[PDB]
Amino acid sequence: ASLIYRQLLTNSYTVDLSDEIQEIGSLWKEMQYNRDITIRFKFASSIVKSGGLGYKWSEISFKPANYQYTYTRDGEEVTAHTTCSVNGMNDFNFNGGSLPTDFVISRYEVIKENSYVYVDYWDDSQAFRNMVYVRSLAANLNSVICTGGDYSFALPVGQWPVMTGGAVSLHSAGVTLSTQFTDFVSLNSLRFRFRLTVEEPSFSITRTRVSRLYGLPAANPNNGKEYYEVAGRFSLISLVPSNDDYQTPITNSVTVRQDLERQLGELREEFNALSQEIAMSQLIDLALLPLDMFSMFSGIKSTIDAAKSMATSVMKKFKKSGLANSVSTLTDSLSDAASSISRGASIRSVGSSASAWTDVSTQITDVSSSVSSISTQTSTISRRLRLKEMATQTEGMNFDDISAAVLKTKIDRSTQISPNTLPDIVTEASEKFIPNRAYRVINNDEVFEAGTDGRFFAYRVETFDEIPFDVQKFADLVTDSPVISAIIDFKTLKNLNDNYGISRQQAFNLLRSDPRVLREFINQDNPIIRNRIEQLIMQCRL
């Protein structure tokens, strides 16, 4: 289950890829609204003429156009407002010559297959005031044909050129949420995308060497039509805040905690309270799942926007936390130690040979309690054995597995979810879950053990009796050999052996944190292992 953390870090690069496009871009009840809509829209034309005698036009281009109308839907006269715009246009040009006399078109816009037509749509119906929290949204529409019409050019001399022809089919491709800016309020609207397909009518300009040109110029794209109409259906699923099964809001304009809080302050208490209802054996079963990104983030009942960015938002927050910086510092220290036989003096070794895993550092030191040097050394080492946990250099199930299992079983139960809450609750959970955790390394039927709390223990596997802890041997063992998380750490092991005489195989498995022995002991309702796992779960307190 710890794999999720690793994967987030591993995938953190994609987060950057998101930000780029983003900065290029700019309980609950499900209620359904399938509505048969009729989008009536149109284009506008900007015809800016150049100086001189009027033979030259500086620009003849598209311009967004607004439209209002009323139509019948299930016997309801519904007033609708739409705004049509275009994107990705081809800037053709005509250059009759350098003289002021010759027909010149500096830049005229034609929409082709590489363009897109965007249409905001709104109405005063119920469906369009329930779409603040949206689960799913999908619209189908019959394609429409937009043909270009005639447009004569105002030359006072000679034949009048005419812009005839031109046609494109708009086919529905995608619908999203959008906003209409009024004078004093802001309206939620449905913005439909339409892909263009060139059609047989080819637009040409008379008095010119222009023919068999395809697209839809901006000159007279309406072709005299009052509007362009597409009839279809849009399906919307809205998440309405409801705390009882008999009520259902007509409108969902309700405020949620994240509309007012950006730093979750009291949701920490919600999580700490949720911790009570956690089962033990089933938690182990969940912790043994290789929880990947899909498994972790598939079961959350999100909104339309939240699901679209859950993984990358979580990862954006993830590649900043103390865990990510600790991983980065460990990697840099290892690379520096490997990169130069120059500063073995700067680093001081608590082992036979120098290693980044076995270096002593700042440790401002705590005179509050009489502290042995060995305790400080072991604590400093264990704080990096945590990065060993998150570097696939462990053997048994690790504390990170338990942390991930608790995180999953809590986020699914927690009713507090939002595009900003899941970030900083996954990351801060990984940071603050099980802060005091111990590790052990086995060698020649002897177990060495260290803890971030500063407690160290050396003992024998066959019989759990403590041994003079041999620093400079625990360090050499721990730099290379597999490191085992101490789920059933020495004290619990000795208590269990004294009270519940365990077999050689059971002790073997418990030492290496084998899941099977753990779950079998839990199923027997053994108070000691249950107590230890309860302490571990309550340590996952965020």
Ligand X SMILES: *[C@@H]1O[C@H](CO)[C@@H](O)[C@H](O)[C@H]1NC(C)=O
Q: Which does 142 bind (CB under 5 to 8 A by kind): another protein, ligand X, none?
A: another protein
Mark residue 132 as left, alpha or beta (left: phi above 0; alpha: psi -120 to 50; beta: remaining). alpha
- Residues, the chain: 542
Q: Report the candidate in 171, 162, 165 with the shortest Cα–Cα distance to residue 119.
A: 171
Q: Which does 143 bind (CB under 5 to 8 A by kind): another protein, ligand X, none?
A: another protein
Q: Which does 334 bind (CB under 5 to 8 A by kind): ligand X, another protein, none?
A: none
Interaction of residue 525 with ligand X, rule CB under 6 A:
no
Report in angstroms how near the CB of residue 530 gets to ligand X at its nearest. 8
CA atoms of 284 and 296, how far apart (whole Å): 16
State which residue, 171 or 491, has the beta carbon closest to another protein. Answer: 171
Q: Which does 222 bind (CB under 5 to 8 A by kind): another protein, ligand X, none?
A: none
Report in angstroms how near the CB of residue 239 gets to ligand X at its nearest. 31
State which residue, 145 or 273, has the beta carbon closest to another protein. Answer: 145
State which residue, 258 or 526, has the beta carbon closest to ligand X. Answer: 526
In the DSSP assignment, the letter for residue 103 is -
Report in angstroms how near the CB of residue 38 gets to another protein at its nearest. 11
Rule CB under 6 A: choose which of 30, 160, 534, 535 binds ligand X.
Answer: 534
Q: Which does 140 bind (CB under 5 to 8 A by kind): ligand X, another protein, none?
A: another protein
* HSE-up of residue 51 (Cα within 13 Å, Cβ side): 0
Report in angstroms how near the CB of residue 115 gets to another protein at its nearest. 15
Phi, psi of 319, rounded to the nearest 5 degrees:
-80, 45
User: Under the rule (CB under 8 A), what is the footprint of another protein?
Assistant: 36, 140, 142-145, 169, 171, 197, 199, 212, 231-233
Report in angstroms how near the CB of residue 149 gets to another protein at its nearest. 16
All residues at 6 or more sequence positions from 20 whose CB lies less than 8 Å from its CB, including other chains: none
CA atoms of 430 and 405, how far apart (whole Å): 11
CA atoms of 129 and 346, how far apart (whole Å): 66
Number of residues that bind ligand X (CB under 6 A): 4
Q: Return the residue nearest ligand X (CB atom).
A: 276
Q: Which does 276 bind (CB under 5 to 8 A by kind): ligand X, another protein, none?
A: ligand X
CA atoms of 523 and 281, how far apart (whole Å): 7
- 447 and 441 in contact (C-beta within 8 Å)? yes
* HSE-up of residue 322 (Cα within 13 Å, Cβ side): 10
Report in angstroms how near the CB of residue 277 gets to ligand X at its nearest. 7
Interaction of residue 279 with ligand X, rule CB under 6 A:
no
Rule CB under 6 A: choose which of 98, 276, 346, 415 binds ligand X.
Answer: 276
Interaction of residue 538 with ligand X, rule CB under 6 A:
yes
All residues at 6 or more sequence positions from 153 whose CB lies less than 8 Å from its CB, including other chains: 57, 103, 160, 161, 162, 163
For strands 44-49 and 56-63, give the pairing. antiparallel
End-to-end CA distance of the chain: 18
Q: Which does 36 bind (CB under 5 to 8 A by kind): another protein, ligand X, none?
A: another protein
Phi, psi of 371, rounded to the nearest 5 degrees:
-115, 130
| Maximal C-alpha separation, the chain | 112
In the DSSP assignment, the letter for residue 347 is S
State which residue, 227 or 500, has the beta carbon closest to another protein. Answer: 227
Q: Which does 232 bind (CB under 5 to 8 A by kind): another protein, ligand X, none?
A: another protein
- Contact set for ligand X, span 357-416 (CB under 6 A): none
Interaction of residue 255 with ligand X, rule CB under 6 A:
no
Phi, psi of 217, rounded to the nearest 5 degrees:
-60, 165
Report in angstroms how near the CB of residue 275 gets to ligand X at its nearest. 6
Q: Which does 144 bind (CB under 5 to 8 A by kind): ligand X, another protein, none?
A: another protein
- 460 and 467 in contact (C-beta within 8 Å)? yes
State which residue, 263 or 276, has the beta carbon closest to ligand X. Answer: 276
Binding site for ligand X (CB under 6 A): 275-276, 534, 538
